[model samples]
Every structure is written in C-alpha cells, then in structure tokens.
Target chain A: GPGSMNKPTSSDGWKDDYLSRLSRLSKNQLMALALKLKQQQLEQG
Target chain B: GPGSMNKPTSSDGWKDDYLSRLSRLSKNQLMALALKLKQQQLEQG
Candidate 1:
C-alpha cells in the first residue's frame, strides 16, 4: 500500500496549528487567553 | 503621565503572545488543547 506523505514546508504552519488549538478552547478559556495576551503586550512595551 | 511605548518589530511576536496565553491556561484546559492538536494533526495528515 502506497500512502502519500505530504510535508508542511510553510514556515507559518505554526500559526495555523496554534490557531487550531485556540479554536478548540471554550469561551471562558478564550477570554483568559485574550486578557493574558493583552497584558503581556502592554508589559513588553 | 507620559509613558514610552515600544512597537513590536518582529513578525514572530504572535508566537510568544500565544505561548504566554497558553501558559495561563489551567492544566485541564492544556490537556484539552493537547488532545485537540493531536487529533487535528492526525486528521489533516
């Protein structure tokens, strides 16, 4: 049986992977994620 | 109050932002994230 093995050559694949994971999170989790991201962004700048 | 704000010049900044958000998630939420990622990876390939 010959199976097609496709490799992800895109450097931005992580973005999609991470987004997919984010999409699976509940609304409450998403809210926490957003708040944390905002906080960190403010702290860094 | 005058505050100095620095902009993010790095395009990969989202990665760190997302990771920070992920770090804030509970262990149960993280377990769900891991499971979903694994499932999606398998489904896509």
Candidate 2:
C-alpha cells in the first residue's frame, strides 16, 4: 500500500537541487555567485 | 594631485572579498551557501 507516492527524503528537495546545480558550476560562476551572496548579506544588514 | 586614497584595481572590493571568503569556506559551507542562492533565485522568480 502506497500512502504517499511523492515522499522525499527531506522536506525540501530544493536544497539538494541547488547543491547539484552549484556542483555543476564552473569556477568563474561560483565566484560570481559568492559575490552576489556577499552583496545580499551587506544589503540586508 | 591625489584625489582618492583607496582606488582599487577593480570597483566593488566586495567581489574579491566574497571570493576570498568563499574560497575559505569548507565544502559543507559552500553547499549550504549554494542552497541559499537557489532559494533566493526561486523566490525572486
């Protein structure tokens, strides 16, 4: 008996999805992404 | 005439700063950061 057909290991699959995408990025892309994160952090603060 | 004292090679030193920070991050930290980025992108979209 299948109660839930779509039962993910974790609540949010986005985390894994994002991790996969990040792993696929080149060094240049990762650098750019880090910069974006830094800017966002500064703006929020 | 010295107009500006701190003229970096490139504008927005945060880019370099962030890159440095990212480089220093452990693999786990980088993965977490990537997830955050993905979520942000999804939210914005």
Candidate 3:
C-alpha cells in the first residue's frame, strides 16, 4: 500500500518546485526516475 | 517557467548519495522533475 511512505502533500516536505532540463530521458522515464530517485535517497541512509 | 530556480550548476544537496530505491531525493530531482513535467504534457491522449 506504499504504506510508511508519506504523501507529498502541501504540509509535508513538499515545496514550491523550480525545475531545469539537463538530460536526454523522455518525460515518463524522468518521472519514473524521479519517483524511483526519491525512494532511493530514502533507503540510502 | 522554472525561472531562476533551475540549473543547479555545481551545487550539492548533501552528498549522501548512492541512494537505494526509497529515501529522500537528490538534487537531480530538479532536472528529472522538470524534464518529466515537460514530457508529461506532450503525451496526453
């Protein structure tokens, strides 16, 4: 249930985001990577 | 627009990399985030 993981609500760590383009990955791949990256950092420590 | 909030140049979020698949996030999120966002709209059916 993706439990233990918090929703990226306004009250959470979520913040007004600014973005940049620097890679060649397609959008879906980027988002999929973003989601995966977010999870990765969480598990690292 | 990402405005002045993009391009990270040579900044660092906190080292703490080699992230697994579930944690916080790396600064790469900004790039990936921006790219994904742009790509998402292009794929709408």
Candidate 4:
C-alpha cells in the first residue's frame, strides 16, 4: 500500500502527528535532534 | 495575532512539523513525552 504506514498509528492526534513529522527527518538529523533533546533534559534536572 | 506563533520557526519542514505537533500536547503530556524520548536516547548508546 502506498500510504499504509501513514495511517493513524494511535488514538491521539498529537502522537500520530509526532510519528508522521518524525518520519520526515533525515537519519543524521534525527540523531542530532535526539541528542539535543537529551541534553536539554539533562540540563533541566 | 491569533496565530502569530504558528509561523514556521525554522528551515526544515520536519522541524516545523515537530513544533506544530508538539504544541498540540498538554503541558503534562509534553513533559512525559520529553522524558520518554530522553530515556530512549540514553538507552540507545
């Protein structure tokens, strides 16, 4: 199917949107964002 | 303006979508998601 994976993955609109938006990022960019987010979390605590 | 903050905050579509999607979450839900994502990154390495 052309867009099977694009179907709603969960009940929450935000969660589904999160996955859809995340899927658009490049692999390297995803890793970088993940690291950046982790650092922010670490610094907040 | 009603939707002033909705303007694209960056060059990447994925990043913009990320913020748009994130803005839909409740403050508590956002904190939970942030914690979960941080944990996933920590465990991945």
Pick by TM-score: which candidate is best?
A: 2
Query: Who wins the DockQ comparison?
Result: 2
Give interface RMSD (Å), model 4: 10.2
Misplaced by over 4 Å in model 4 are: A1-35, A38-45, B1-11
- Stronger candidate by DockQ (1 vs 3): 3
Q: Report the C-alpha lDDT of model 4 over A1-45, residue by residue, as the tens digit.
A: 584654354654564566556556654555455556855655464
DockQ of 1: 0.05
Q: Please identify which of the two predictions, 2 or 4, would achieve the higher DockQ against the true structure.
A: 2
Local accuracy of candidate 4 as per-residue lDDT tens digits, B1-45: 335455554334455456656666654565566557855554453
Error of 4 at B29 (Å): 0.3
Candidates in descending DockQ order = 2, 3, 4, 1
CA lDDT of every candidate: 0.56, 0.66, 0.46, 0.56
Task: For candidate 3, write residues A1-45 as lDDT tens digits.
Answer: 345645644342322332433355564555465665444444442
| Backbone atom clashes (below 3 Å) for every candidate | 0, 0, 13, 0
Decide which is better by TM-score, 2 or 3: 2
Could you tell me how far off, in angstroms, the CA of residue B44 lies in candidate 3 after the best superposition?
36
What's the best-to-worst order under TM-score? 2, 4, 1, 3
TM-score of 4: 0.39
Q: Model 1: C-alpha RMSD to truth? A: 12.4
B1-45: candidate 2 lDDT, tens digit per residue: 234545556467646556877777766678787677655654442
lDDT of 1 at A14: 53
